[PDB]
Nucleic acid binder design. Structure first.
Ligand code: SF4
Ligand SMILES: [Mg+2]
Ligand SMILES: [Mg+2]
Ligand SMILES: [Mg+2]
Ligand SMILES: [Mg+2]
Ligand SMILES: [Mg+2]
Ligand SMILES: [Mg+2]
Ligand SMILES: [Mg+2]
Ligand SMILES: [Mg+2]
Ligand SMILES: [Mg+2]
Ligand SMILES: [Mg+2]
Ligand SMILES: [Mg+2]
Ligand SMILES: [Mg+2]
Ligand SMILES: [Mg+2]
Ligand SMILES: [Mg+2]
Ligand SMILES: [Mg+2]
Ligand SMILES: [Mg+2]
Ligand SMILES: [Mg+2]
Ligand SMILES: [Mg+2]
Ligand SMILES: [Mg+2]
Ligand SMILES: [Mg+2]
Ligand SMILES: [Mg+2]
Ligand SMILES: [Mg+2]
Ligand SMILES: [Mg+2]
Ligand SMILES: [Mg+2]
Ligand SMILES: [Mg+2]
Ligand SMILES: [Mg+2]
Ligand SMILES: [Mg+2]
Ligand SMILES: [Mg+2]
Ligand SMILES: [Mg+2]
Ligand SMILES: [Mg+2]
Ligand SMILES: [Mg+2]
Ligand SMILES: [Mg+2]
Ligand SMILES: [Mg+2]
Ligand SMILES: [Mg+2]
Lengths: 208, 122, 84, 84
RNA sequence: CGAGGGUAGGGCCCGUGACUGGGGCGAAGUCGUAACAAGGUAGCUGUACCGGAAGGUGCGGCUGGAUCACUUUCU
RNA sequence: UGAAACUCAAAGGAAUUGACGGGGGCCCGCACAAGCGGUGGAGCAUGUGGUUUAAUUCGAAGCAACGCGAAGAACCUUAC
RNA sequence: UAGCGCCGGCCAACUCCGUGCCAGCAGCCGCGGUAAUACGGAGGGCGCGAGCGUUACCCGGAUUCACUGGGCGUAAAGGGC
């Protein structure tokens, strides 16, 4: 399912930072800040102008590796979005941001999306009072998402919520830091969600 | 042509042919080798491609190519046909599959192991 | 299948000796091939034209050829270094 | 003149070809010695008798010999690695 | 009445198959020079005859023929 | 009227550049023609093919290799 | 528990060594006769992932039977009238 292994090869590969580690992604020991040329012993050699399909593939892999999801889930969500009314790209981004592991990262309960996936996989997260174990839950608007009361000591989440106060959450989300609970108000918009991608290229890629 | 001509005659379908006459499109077929042989290829190149004549379950007798380096084929060996022609060899429209029948796999191969039927070493 | 050599063939064989053994191994490869398959096999077996009628030639290199002939239980070799 | 190798005469030749090239050089020199003159030369040219009548034998080492014959403007060679 | 069977006859298909006919791919094999330049007699075409073979010729047609108006192989 | 098996990675139309023509038109060069000597004959010198020698070191191949690398081989030169 | 295919173009991913018109690859174009990004391993990379490749079959691309959407002087095609 989840892509395991090295993760700094990715920010180095797409040439754009992906922040798939969290706290280290702001440190000066960041892979790109240290070495921005791609890996694989041919990084120092200049890059030939890629094909159009290469650009489409790189942006698709970029957007897919942002959230760290399987290709089979990705294409299914894509086809679910396109065959739906509204602009397919932004609603695709909305469905991708409506993931449970994504919103717990967006709520700042975790520092990384993978850490978020590990947290929701262990049942440390609940929605509307009921505990859930899967990161692929489609979060609906108005859902009361929180951390379980039985897992409220949890030194890791205590230090995460302790550093969470003072920072600002996204406009489509609300968070009670002391009560440790967020609310999913509305579906995000592309202006409300700054990503270093061009979704139109992804639309062009899957339309082959 | 005029619409009336299409009303009378109509359009003929393409009616595609079968490249592989392996008894109504069976993917693979069990056969027995009769003659193992090395055959000189066509002439844009030159080699000693390994070819085995196989008589199979449908009563047909056709040639087959043996990929990889070396084999253990004899004049009496139960094999499995694969299908897939080879350009340099005329008359050979098939391939043999290494790995499961009397035909053994490839000794000491590590890159494309699923092809040529070789397991994972160590 | 007795072997038969000419004077220029053997002299050129010695010319191949002390210079480069790869050509020598290629010759031996062609000898065993022709002992097994005289009119087929490696080296692209090909007959010749108007002046050299009744013989055969095999491609040693991209520049050199081997001229030979086969009688019953006999194999004659000539010109192992020339260009047709 | 013409040169003739037998079927068993090439196995010992290829045997010496992959072990020691020096012996091979002495072999080529004695073949050149027989090429300059038929009945004379290096290797104590002496004929053989009834079982190998018409054939002679030359020396390469004291443990290995050469069986040969000269006629039809040709040179026949039987073996080069054994006493006989 | 009737499944079916038998005798005689007719037609059709399948498999094997003595004897044959041509074909397609491969090899700088052999013998030729047919065709591409006026291919060295301009070529092509229907037909008829002849010829180891390409092809030669007759009768008629076409230009998709040229240019101002002895014979000479092959790579 | 009119197929199939088998086989090919093409077959084809027009047009561009070039090459070619026992196609045409125009024009040069000792290219012919006109003329003077000359080779090929003979003896010798040198270089080469071939043959022989243990070695006759190697290269150079029609024009455009052959009194050529050699504007200096008795050993030295020299690599045989 | 991590595996499978690929890295000449189509088609995303490159180097060294081994090999020497052999062993071989191959859907098509085509690579291999001593510097092979194509063969065979290694390293590295790309795609996908409890799957990954292959074979067979159907539709597509194929507007290549063209109703939407093809043509017929010289490419296949105007029937001798
Ligand atoms: S910033 Fe974080 S996610 Fe990005 S390359 Fe560095 S370690 Fe990896
Ligand atoms: Mg839409
Ligand atoms: Mg589509
Ligand atoms: Mg009846
Ligand atoms: Mg004619
Ligand atoms: Mg006629
Ligand atoms: Mg006749
Ligand atoms: Mg006839
Ligand atoms: Mg006549
Ligand atoms: Mg006429
Ligand atoms: Mg014409
Ligand atoms: Mg006229
Ligand atoms: Mg034309
Ligand atoms: Mg012109
Ligand atoms: Mg003159
Ligand atoms: Mg004159
Ligand atoms: Mg004078
Ligand atoms: Mg005169
Ligand atoms: Mg003179
Ligand atoms: Mg001297
Ligand atoms: Mg690429
Ligand atoms: Mg491969
Ligand atoms: Mg295929
Ligand atoms: Mg090198
Ligand atoms: Mg190499
Ligand atoms: Mg090369
Ligand atoms: Mg490849
Ligand atoms: Mg490789
Ligand atoms: Mg298709
Ligand atoms: Mg269609
Ligand atoms: Mg139509
Ligand atoms: Mg058309
Ligand atoms: Mg035509
Ligand atoms: Mg036509
Ligand atoms: Mg008409």
């Amino acid at each position: 399912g989840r892509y395991i292994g090295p993760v700094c090869r990715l920010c180095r590969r797409e040439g754009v930072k992906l922040y798939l580690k969290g706290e280290r992604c702001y440190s000066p020991k960041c892979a790109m800040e240290r070495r921005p040329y791609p890996p694989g012993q041919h990084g120092q050699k200049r890059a030939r102008r890629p094909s159009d399909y290469a650009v489409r593939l790189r942006e698709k892999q970029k957007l897919r590796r942002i959230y760290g999801i399987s290709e089979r889930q990705f294409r299914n969500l894509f086809e679910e979005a396109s065959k739906k009314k509204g602009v397919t790209g932004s609603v695709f981004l909305g469905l991708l941001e409506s993931r449970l592991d994504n919103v717990v990262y967006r709520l700042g309960f975790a520092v990384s999306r993978r850490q978020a996936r590990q947290l929701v996989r262990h049942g440390h997260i609940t929605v509307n009072g009921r505990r859930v174990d899967l990161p692929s839950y489609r979060v609906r608007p108005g859902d009361e998402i929180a951390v379980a009361e039985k897992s409220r000591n949890l030194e890791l989440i205590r230090q995460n919520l302790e550093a969470m106060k003072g920072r600002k959450v996204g406009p489509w989300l609300s968070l009670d830091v002391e009560g440790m609970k967020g609310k999913f108000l509305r579906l995000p918009d592309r202006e409300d969600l700054a990503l270093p991608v061009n979704e139109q290229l992804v639309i062009e890629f899957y339309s082959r | 042509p005029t619409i009336n001509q299409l009303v009378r005659k109509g359009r003929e379908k393409v009616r595609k042919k079968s490249k592989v006459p392996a008894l109504k499109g069976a993917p693979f077929r069990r056969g027995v080798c009769t003659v193992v042989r090395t055959v000189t290829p066509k002439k844009p190149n030159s080699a000693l491609r390994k070819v085995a004549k196989v008589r199979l379950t449908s009563g047909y007798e056709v040639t087959a190519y043996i990929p990889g380096e070396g084999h253990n084929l004899q004049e009496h060996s139960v094999v499995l046909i694969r299908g897939g022609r080879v350009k340099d060899l005329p008359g050979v429209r098939y391939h043999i599959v290494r790995g499961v029948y009397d035909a053994a796999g490839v000794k000491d191969r590590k890159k494309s192991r699923s092809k040529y039927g070789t397991k994972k070493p160590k | 299948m007795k072997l038969i050599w000419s004077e220029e063939s053997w002299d050129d064989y010695l010319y191949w000796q002390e210079t480069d053994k790869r050509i020598v191994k290629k010759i031996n490869e062609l000898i065993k091939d022709t002992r097994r398959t005289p009119f087929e096999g490696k080296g692209k077996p090909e007959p010749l034209k108007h002046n050299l009628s009744g013989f055969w030639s095999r491609r040693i290199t991209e520049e050199h050829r081997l001229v030979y002939a086969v009688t019953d239980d006999s194999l004659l070799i000539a010109a192992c270094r020339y260009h047709y």
